[PDB]
């Protein structure tokens, strides 16, 4: 009773296909045609943070837009004061291969993770003045690729075992389990109201999730290769994904389609990181060819290039007030642009 | 007015940097190795959670070997974490399924990855005793073995069969065919023959890591 189920799935796919095709009456290019361009966007590197011994995989800003954490595979989480280029903490880890780092919006906690299959929470606000491990979350069967805080007690993780998970930090137990991907999940992005999040795995698919009930709401296809980065639009009604096929793409949640593609013939390297600006007009993307291209979101134009790294750009992040952007790379340097 | 809350930050940065200067010296004095192998390759034998660490020490040199335990058989996203390693220790069951060809395909993918272009491979061609035991009691899966002649630069063991010598050197040449087709002087391959009982494997890895460090230092002077 297998081919009949597959033909039912096929006719459901066809119904979804033409139900999406009936909604595309015009293109985003047709509508933002007469909008004025943004011009050449020139940025300057304002700080270069030094101190990591090996390549940087992850970084995350604090919600005060002054502090940022970074993770390097020499086994250190270094917290920085971006305004004064001073180190506030240097946390040694029990596993060298860290691949994700998260900053809690309260500012009290930091979470790292990697090939140890464990999400370790750290407490930056202690009595003895020592940053110690609060809890180590076990239960994933593959490596951790992404982790994002929701409160001081909840955290969502992404693993290489094709699963996302919701955790309850005070009990250490996995509450909700998000299944559905057929390849390893690489990135997460939370919605601005923390009721939804979207994941991008190495099966050329993006999926929307309900944090409350644990159900998949929508699935988005269109990329040809593995998705490596997802970011939400600042209003929560759209998101952007970067892949190994050298294209970023914009999706809507109410139209269930793709609205724009951002590609050039001179770009043949994959995309590592994706971030929007505060207005949502600029899309910043880090590439494997050591650069970072700025895009116009409502159009498909390059507004500028952030050049200055000497190895693969690994992580991007725009502050909560949009004042600056931070880039890390395998040259073991962090650069802040403005 | 606010300078009292800036000298504290400067003192904290002083202390952090004075610790990081010790971390840098303990980091650069250690050589990290990735122990990779296929199924039934005897990898856990020559070893003598997602990652299994194992530290050893040869002539006051600290080594740090790593083995992937819990990960799936996808590898294209977590093998990129293993640049900056001194070498990749690759183990093959050199003896149901054509697992020798699976090992050749994995080696071809590792040697030709955009990010592994600078990492060297120490090839441990394992199970030579079983290879002899089987060739005493192959060209069906490798047609070019009917044309293969033993290299006259061979270094056989005393009293050994000219059959098992030819078989083992055929497999070594199958791997060197991939190793020599690319590289352009960026990374090197070190093939070895390891049996069931070999204490010399740690010494072999030591000598090969020494060679890699020497060649990197020479390339920094544009001498090679």
């Amino acid at each position: 009773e297998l081919d009949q189920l597959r033909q039912e799935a096929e006719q459901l796919k066809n119904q979804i296909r033409d139900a999406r095709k009936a909604c595309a009456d015009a293109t985003l290019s047709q509508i933002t045609n007469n909008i004025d361009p943004v011009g050449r966007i020139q940025m300057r590197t304002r700080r270069t943070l030094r101190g990591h011994l090996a390549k940087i995989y992850a970084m995350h800003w604090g919600t005060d837009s002054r502090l940022l954490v970074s993770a390097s595979q020499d086994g250190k989480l270094i917290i920085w004061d971006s305004y004064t280029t001073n180190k506030v903490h240097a946390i040694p880890l029990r596993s060298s291969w860290v691949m994700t780092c998260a900053y809690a919006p309260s500012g009290n906690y930091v979470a790292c993770g990697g090939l140890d299959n464990i999400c370790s929470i750290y407490n930056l606000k202690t009595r003895e003045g020592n940053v110690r491990v609060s809890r180590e979350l076990a239960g994933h069967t593959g490596y951790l690729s992404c982790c994002r805080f929701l409160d001081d007690n909840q955290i969502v993780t992404s693993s290489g075992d094709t699963t996302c998970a919701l955790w309850d930090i005070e009990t250490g137990q996995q509450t909700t389990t998000f299944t559905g991907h057929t390849g390893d999940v690489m990135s997460l992005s939370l919605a601005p109201d923390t009721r939804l999040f979207v994941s991008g795995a190495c099966d050329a698919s993006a999926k929307l999730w309900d944090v409350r009930e644990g159900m998949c709401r929508q699935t988005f296809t269109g990329h040809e290769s593995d998705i490596n980065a997802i970011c939400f639009f600042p209003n929560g009604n759209a998101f952007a994904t970067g892949s190994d096929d050298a294209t970023c793409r914009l999706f809507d949640l109410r139209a269930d389609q793709e609205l724009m593609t951002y590609s050039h013939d001179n770009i043949i390297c994959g995309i590592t990181s994706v971030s929007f600006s505060k207005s949502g007009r600029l899309l910043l993307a880090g590439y494997d060819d050591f650069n970072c291209n700025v895009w116009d979101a409502l159009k498909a134009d390059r507004a500028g290039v952030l050049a200055g790294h000497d190895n693969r750009v690994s992580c991007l992040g725009v502050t909560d007030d949009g004042m600056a952007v931070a880039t890390g790379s395998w040259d073991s340097f962090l650069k802040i642009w403005n | 007015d606010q300078r009292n809350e800036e000298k504290a930050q400067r003192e904290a940065n002083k202390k952090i940097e004075k610790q990081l200067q010790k971390d840098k010296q303990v980091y650069r004095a250690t050589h990290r190795l990735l122990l990779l192998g296929a199924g039934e390759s005897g990898k856990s034998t020559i070893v003598k959670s997602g990652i299994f660490e194992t530290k050893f020490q040869v002539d006051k040199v600290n080594f740090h070997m790593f083995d992937v335990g819990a990960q799936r058989d996808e590898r294209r996203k977590w093998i990129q974490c293993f640049n900056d390693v001194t070498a990749i220790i690759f183990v093959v069951a050199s003896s149901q399924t054509n697992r020798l060809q699976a090992a050749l395909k994995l080696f071809d993918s590792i040697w030709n990855n955009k990010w592994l272009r600078d990492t060297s491979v120490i090839l441990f061609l394992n199970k030579q005793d079983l290879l002899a035991e089987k060739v005493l009691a192959i060209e069906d899966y490798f047609p070019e073995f009917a044309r293969y002649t033993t290299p006259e630069d061979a270094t056989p063991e005393p009293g050994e069969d000219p059959r098992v010598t030819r078989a083992k050197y055929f497999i070594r040449d199958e791997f060197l065919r991939i190793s020599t087709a690319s590289g352009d002087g960026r990374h090197y391959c070190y093939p070895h023959f390891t049996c069931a009982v070999d204490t010399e494997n740690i010494r072999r890895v030591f000598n090969d890591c020494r060679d890699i460090i020497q060649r990197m230092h020479l390339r920094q002077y544009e001498l090679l």
Partner: nanobody, 126 residues
Framework: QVQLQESGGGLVQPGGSLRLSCAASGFTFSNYKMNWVRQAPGKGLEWVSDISQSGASISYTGSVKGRFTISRDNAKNTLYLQMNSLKPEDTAVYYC?????????????????????RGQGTQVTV
């Protein structure tokens, strides 16, 4: 969507010949190296042959050399395997697989149990 559709399987009394086709929609077929992988009953996934972006570099496993020919047609988005002089040990489900990344020479995990860029396969029986 990245979709691969095979056809051309069936029954061949030993010694005959078959042609397998693979229709590919959902990606730029010219930027990708393609593969042919099979699964014998009670066995794992094995690698049969591969072909580059342009059909310049071609490789086969030793058990099929001189008997199979892989070929592309980058214009009509199709891939072929001409199975000539079939032995009774060639019975397997044959899958059309794609390397995961454009403009690359390495293909890591085509013979994995859960690989996304691979069709449902066709069953040839000798």
């Amino acid at each position: 969507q990245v979709q691969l559709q095979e056809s051309g399987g069936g029954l061949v009394q030993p010694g005959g010949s078959l042609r397998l086709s693979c229709a590919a929609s959902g990606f730029t077929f010219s930027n990708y190296k393609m593969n042919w992988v099979r699964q014998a009953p009670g066995k794992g996934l094995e690698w049969v042959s591969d072909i580059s972006q342009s059909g310049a570099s071609i490789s086969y496993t030793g058990s099929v050399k001189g008997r199979f020919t892989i070929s592309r047609d980058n214009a009509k988005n199709t891939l072929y395997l001409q199975m000539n002089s079939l032995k009774p040990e060639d019975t397997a489900v044959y899958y059309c697989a794609r390397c995961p990344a454009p403009f690359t020479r390495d293909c890591f995990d085509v013979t994995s149990t859960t690989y996304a860029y691979r069709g449902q396969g066709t069953q040839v029986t000798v």
